[PDB]
Structures are given as structure tokens and as C-alpha cells.
Amino acid sequence: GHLPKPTLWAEPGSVITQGSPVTLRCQGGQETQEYRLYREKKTAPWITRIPQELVKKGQFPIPSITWEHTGRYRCYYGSDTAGRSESSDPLELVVTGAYIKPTLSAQPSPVVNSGGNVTLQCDSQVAFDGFILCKEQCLNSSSRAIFSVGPVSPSRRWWYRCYAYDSNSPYEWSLPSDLLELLVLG
């Protein structure tokens, strides 16, 4: 048989502010209907609540996301009996807004030359053991983290936001830092 691995994504995205809606989506074959979504390590009861009418379209909506929804998800279609596809690449569903927002700055500055590298610093008013830098994807880093980005170029937009988080609950992030725009001389 041949049941290609499905694509899994979230709308509007995988990083959602607490209380906002998000819909996880799975795309298998053109006629696929037997979609299955699941969370790694801990079962997600909210999935069992999804109407079959939506499941068949690969739609798994969360009207108002909460801390309980966060986690690593994967989807596949079919069954052991009828035959199933491999599981999709993982999607890390994260909720933001759990902590005060950090500040993001560029060193030496936000204005750099094409081809140059810049250091981005995420500073928090209090201690956190983890920081995230997302390009508006994201990457992981006692109240500040340093990230290196580049080579930068004028042909692309360089917008960033950073977050602070606690390693004991890695899928819940702080409020996002203000957006930082790098200006590339070019």
C-alpha cells in the first residue's frame, strides 16, 4: 500500500495567546477521511470531543486555548486494520501570556550592513531558565539570553520577538517582547 505521511499545521499558528482560538489541521490524501490526531506523552481529552464531521475534514478546533492544551501533536490517517500512514512531523502547540514580557534588543544595534551578523539579547526583569527567539521560526536559548542571527540581507524582512519560559513547563511562554525590526543597509 501507500499512505503518504500527512502534513500537520495550526491556524492561525502554533504559538497562541491564552484564551484565543486555534484549529489544528491535518492534510492526507485527497479522499482521506479517517484522520487521527494525538498528543505525545499525555493523552489530550479535548481531541475526543471533536465532532466526526470535523475530523473527516482534518479539522480539530480549540475555541479558547488554555494551559491544558499545550503539547507536542502529530496526526495520521487510517487505522491498523485498514492500513495507516506514518505520523506527521510534530507540531508544538504553545500558549503565551503566562509571564511578564521580556525586552529584546540588538547589539551593536538594530541597523546593520547586509551580510552582517547581530547579537540579539532577551532580558527579563526576573529570573527564568529558558528563553525563546522567534523570527516573525523559533529557537531556545540568569535573567537574559543571547542569540546570534545572520548573515542578514535586505532581500528579506528581519522581525523578531522573544519569550521567557520555565523549563518545568516548556510549552507555556511569557507575553511576547515588543517586536524588534532589524534595518539592513541595502
From Swiss-Prot:
Distribution of this protein across tissues and organs: Expressed in B cells, monocytes and various dendritic cell (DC) subsets including myeloid, plasmacytoid and tolerogenic DCs (at protein level). Expressed in decidual macrophages (at protein level). Expressed in decidual NK cells (at protein level).
PTM notes: Phosphorylated on tyrosine residues. Dephosphorylated by PTPN6.
Disulfide bonds: C26-C75, C122-C162, C134-C138
Domain of life: Eukaryota
Domain Ig-like C2-type stretches: 4-92, 93-186
Annotated localization: Cell membrane
Subunit details: Binds PTPN6 when phosphorylated. Binds FCER1A and FCGR1A. Interacts with human cytomegalovirus/HHV-5 protein UL18. Interacts with peptide-bound HLA-G-B2M complex. Interacts with peptide-bound HLA-F-B2M complex but not with peptide-free HLA-F open conformer. It does not probe the peptide sequence directly.
Free-text note on domains in this protein's UniProt record: Contains 4 copies of a cytoplasmic motif that is referred to as the immunoreceptor tyrosine-based inhibitor motif (ITIM). This motif is involved in modulation of cellular responses. The phosphorylated ITIM motif can bind the SH2 domain of several SH2-containing phosphatases.
Functional note: Receptor for class I MHC antigens. Recognizes a broad spectrum of HLA-A, HLA-B, HLA-C, HLA-G and HLA-F alleles. Receptor for H301/UL18, a human cytomegalovirus class I MHC homolog. Ligand binding results in inhibitory signals and down-regulation of the immune response. Engagement of LILRB1 present on natural killer cells or T-cells by class I MHC molecules protects the target cells from lysis. Interaction with HLA-B or HLA-E leads to inhibition of FCER1A signaling and serotonin release.
Protein name: Leukocyte immunoglobulin-like receptor subfamily B member 1
Residues of the full protein shown: 24 to 221 of 650
